[PDB]
Amino acid sequence: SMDDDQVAFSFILDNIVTQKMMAVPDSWPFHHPVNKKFVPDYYKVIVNPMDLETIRKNISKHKYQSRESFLDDVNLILANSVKYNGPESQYTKTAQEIVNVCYQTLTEYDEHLTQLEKDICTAKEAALEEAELESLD
Ligand SMILES: C[C@@H]1COCCN1c1cc(C2(S(C)(=O)=O)CC2)nc(-c2cccc3[nH]ccc23)n1
């Protein structure tokens, strides 16, 4: 089923987040959205915030249908640290390690993720066509 495939795709991604990315030492700065009361200027500087809790929420909503779309948000965590903290900040070195262990684990699971991604896309295109042929009956 496409639902079955979406669940498996999302579970693989969630496991990368919880078992690999969140396990990077000293990764606490990236586990949750920045609290505006704690860092009042954060949202004046960072226009497109992202963090590992938000990624997990997006996974639970099946937002990510591709490896690329998942990695778009993973990379925002790193890019926002470069912007807010600087490219040589220890915060950014930590974010870089989060991104790198993500890549490493996506590589490990690329065959299964690619197959799920393709089959989800095929199924979605077929359901779209059938929905459209139906609406015109
Ligand atoms: C901005 C800074 C560097 O760039 C990445 C995210 N960083 C975070 C994140 C968090 C959160 S939190 C607790 O707001 O949920 C998301 C985890 N807090 C604090 C923080 C809060 C209060 C006093 C502080 N003094 C130094 C850092 C700091 N900095």
Curated annotation (Swiss-Prot):
Highest rank taxon of the organism: Eukaryota
Post-translational modification: Phosphorylated by casein kinase II in vitro.
Domain Bromo: 3-109
Signal peptide: none
Location in or out of the cell: Nucleus
Domain notes: The Bromo domain mediates interaction with histones that have acetylated lysine residues at specific positions. The second domain also recognizes and binds histones that are butyrylated and crotonylated.
Similarity comment: family membership: Belongs to the TAF1 family.
Disease entry from the Swiss-Prot or TrEMBL record: Dystonia 3, torsion, X-linked: An X-linked dystonia-parkinsonism disorder. Dystonia is defined by the presence of sustained involuntary muscle contractions, often leading to abnormal postures. DYT3 is characterized by severe progressive torsion dystonia followed by parkinsonism. It has a well-defined pathology of extensive neuronal loss and mosaic gliosis in the striatum (caudate nucleus and putamen) which appears to resemble that in Huntington disease. Intellectual developmental disorder, X-linked, syndromic 33: A syndrome characterized by intellectual deficit, delayed psychomotor development, delayed speech and language, and characteristic facial features.
Function: The TFIID basal transcription factor complex plays a major role in the initiation of RNA polymerase II (Pol II)-dependent transcription. TFIID recognizes and binds promoters with or without a TATA box via its subunit TBP, a TATA-box-binding protein, and promotes assembly of the pre-initiation complex (PIC). The TFIID complex consists of TBP and TBP-associated factors (TAFs), including TAF1, TAF2, TAF3, TAF4, TAF5, TAF6, TAF7, TAF8, TAF9, TAF10, TAF11, TAF12 and TAF13. TAF1 is the largest component and core scaffold of the TFIID complex, involved in nucleating complex assembly.
Assembly and interaction partners: Component of the TFIID basal transcription factor complex, composed of TATA-box-binding protein TBP, and a number of TBP-associated factors (TAFs), including TAF1, TAF2, TAF3, TAF4, TAF5, TAF6, TAF7, TAF8, TAF9, TAF10, TAF11, TAF12 and TAF13. Interacts with TAF7; the interaction is direct. TAF1, when part of the TFIID complex, interacts with C-terminus of TP53.
Protein's name according to its UniProt entry: Transcription initiation factor TFIID subunit 1
Organism, as annotated: Homo sapiens (Human)
Lineage: Eukaryota, Metazoa, Chordata, Craniata, Vertebrata
Parent-protein residues present: 1522 to 1656 of 1893
